[PDB]
């Protein structure tokens, strides 16, 4: 019950991963992958435009 | 005589709406700066059912541009919208289902819904299941847009007014019979107390103008003037015609 979470230790309420006691392991995996790939594609969208502007 | 049932609903005691299980008002996002200069992106998190309403609602999450915060908004879901869909709202947004473009920036024939009749009212025309507004034309000078509403009326409204592109979901709801007083009872258990309906001609004349008589009969004409008063308006108010509709409305 909610108030009983104040009587127990931190180890009983989290796991040792990022977003540990809030998000699932596979959801964390998904958002890691999404972040990495979307930032790489942001770089790519940037250099495409940097190519087009130097061209024209 | 006695105060009649239609007079008695205005006091709003047992006739008020039952709004316990309603998720909130289905409003468009406030028209702040981004929706009139560019676009803002939000995301559909869930499509939920709203009590008292056939159309489903979409919980769309946008970001606050001025504070670190995650303001949520309640849209009426358009048919074809799904969870994890990116909604784009504003002037320079793309003509796709679920986007909140202005009406000036859409072509003619476009099907929209939840249309502001005045910019900033955050949701009006075409809000119910299966309903949509059609754009007909533009007056770019005298910046205005003519639209066909679901009633058949034509309306001139500002081009800066907004609308959600697509059709309101839940269409086809009134095609199914209820078959049961109980199904109607549960329909109106969550809307308001307007059911069951006793016929005025089944009443005493103290309770209703049509009441009384040794046969059930209205006696005088059920067509009531618009300049009648409360207590007289029980029948067909300001009826231009009457009877079975034989042909085109000619509108």
């Amino acid at each position: 019950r909610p108030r009983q979470y104040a009587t127990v230790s931190k180890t009983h309420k989290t796991v040792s991963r990022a977003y540990g006691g809030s998000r699932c392991a596979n959801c964390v995996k998904e958002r890691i992958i999404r972040a990495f790939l979307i930032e790489e594609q942001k770089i790519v969208k940037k250099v495409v435009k940097e190519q087009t502007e130097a061209a024209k | 005589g006695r105060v009649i049932r239609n007079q008695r609903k205005g006091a709003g005691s047992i006739f008020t709406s039952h709004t316990r299980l309603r998720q909130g008002a289905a409003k468009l996002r406030t028209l702040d700066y981004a929706e009139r200069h560019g676009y803002i992106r939000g995301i559909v998190k869930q499509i939920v059912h709203d009590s008292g309403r056939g159309a489903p609602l979409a919980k769309v999450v946008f970001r606050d541009p001025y504070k670190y915060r995650l303001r949520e908004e309640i849209f009426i879901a358009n048919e074809g919208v799904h969870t994890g869909q990116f909604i784009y709202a504003g002037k320079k947004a793309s003509l796709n289902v679920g986007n909140v473009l202005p009406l000036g920036s859409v072509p003619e024939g476009t099907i929209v819904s939840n249309v502001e009749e005045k910019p900033g009212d955050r949701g009006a025309l075409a809000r119910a299941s299966g309903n949509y507004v059609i754009i007909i034309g533009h007056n770019p000078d005298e910046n205005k847009t003519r639209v066909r509403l679901p009633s058949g009326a034509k309306k001139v409204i500002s081009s800066d007014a907004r609308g959600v592109i697509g059709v309101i979901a839940g269409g086809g709801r009134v095609d199914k019979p209820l078959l049961k007083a109980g199904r109607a009872f549960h329909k109106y258990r969550l809307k308001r107390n307007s059911w069951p309906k006793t016929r005025g001609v089944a009443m005493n004349p103290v309770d209703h103008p049509h009441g009384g008589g040794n046969h059930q009969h209205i006696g005088k004409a059920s067509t009531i003037s618009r300049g009648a008063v409360s207590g007289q308006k029980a029948g067909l108010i300001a009826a231009r015609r009457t009877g079975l509709l034989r042909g085109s409305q000619k509108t």
Partner: protein, 233 residues
């Protein structure tokens, strides 16, 4: 230097939560602020009738500094110097038996509205100063016409608070010199010559011209655009 980098943030529409900008133009001000601003707006969008805007033309700051320099030589007596004056007079009443004329004749600026109107009507006033910031303006709207009828030079000057500082009050709303010393009558004449040119000699033409009729920025621009879109050929 190798540890620091350039992040720069894109404060475009759908990016990068906006920074703290000066929203001094968008404040929800208190109602007294809005009253005192929209009042001065409304008093110039309306066609002001010439008896008002008889004001709105005030003494230039240079000749105003000069006339206040003059008037500050003729200032009333404070409580302290009045008290020692009357101690001297009580001493003299006993020892010299003067007829209350042991003290000399005073030369002081005449103030008070009912006093000064009477001075003007009796033509004892040499110069009159009139404040523009009077909140019931009907207290002073008649004073230019009266000074003109009786031949008195008047000057509408900025600051009833300045007149009050001049005369040991907070506000005075009017001031007047009726008698001046010979050391300064020449400057008084030099001053009246400059003032009558600006106020009394222009009375008959500023009595014709209605004030106000002034527009805001967003409306004057909409009028100018319409004009220069109409005046092309």
């Amino acid at each position: 230097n190798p540890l620091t980098h350039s992040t720069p943030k894109n404060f475009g529409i759908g990016q990068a939560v906006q920074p703290k900008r000066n929203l001094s133009r968008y404040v929800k001000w208190p109602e007294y602020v809005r009253v005192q601003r929209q009042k001065k707006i409304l008093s110039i969008r309306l066609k002001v009738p010439p008896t008002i805007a008889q004001f709105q033309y005030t003494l230039d700051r240079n000749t105003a500094a000069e006339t206040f320099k003059l008037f500050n030589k003729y200032r009333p007596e404070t409580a302290a110097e009045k008290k020692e004056r009357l101690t001297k007079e009580a001493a003299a009443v006993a020892e010299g038996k003067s007829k209350q004329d042991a003290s000399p004749k005073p030369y002081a600026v005449k103030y008070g509205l009912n006093h000064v109107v009477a001075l003007i009507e009796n033509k004892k006033a040499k110069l009159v100063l009139i404040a523009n910031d009077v909140d019931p303006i009907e207290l002073v709207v008649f004073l230019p016409a009266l000074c003109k009828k009786m031949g008195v030079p008047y000057a509408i000057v900025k600051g009833k608070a300045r007149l009050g500082t001049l005369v040991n009050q907070k506000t005075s709303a009017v001031a007047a010199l009726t008698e001046v010393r010979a050391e300064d009558e020449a400057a008084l004449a030099k001053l009246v010559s400059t003032i009558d040119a600006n106020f009394a000699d222009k009375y008959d033409e500023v009595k014709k011209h209605w004030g106000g009729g002034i527009l805001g920025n967003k409306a004057q621009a909409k009028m100018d655009k319409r004009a220069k879109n109409s005046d092309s050929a």
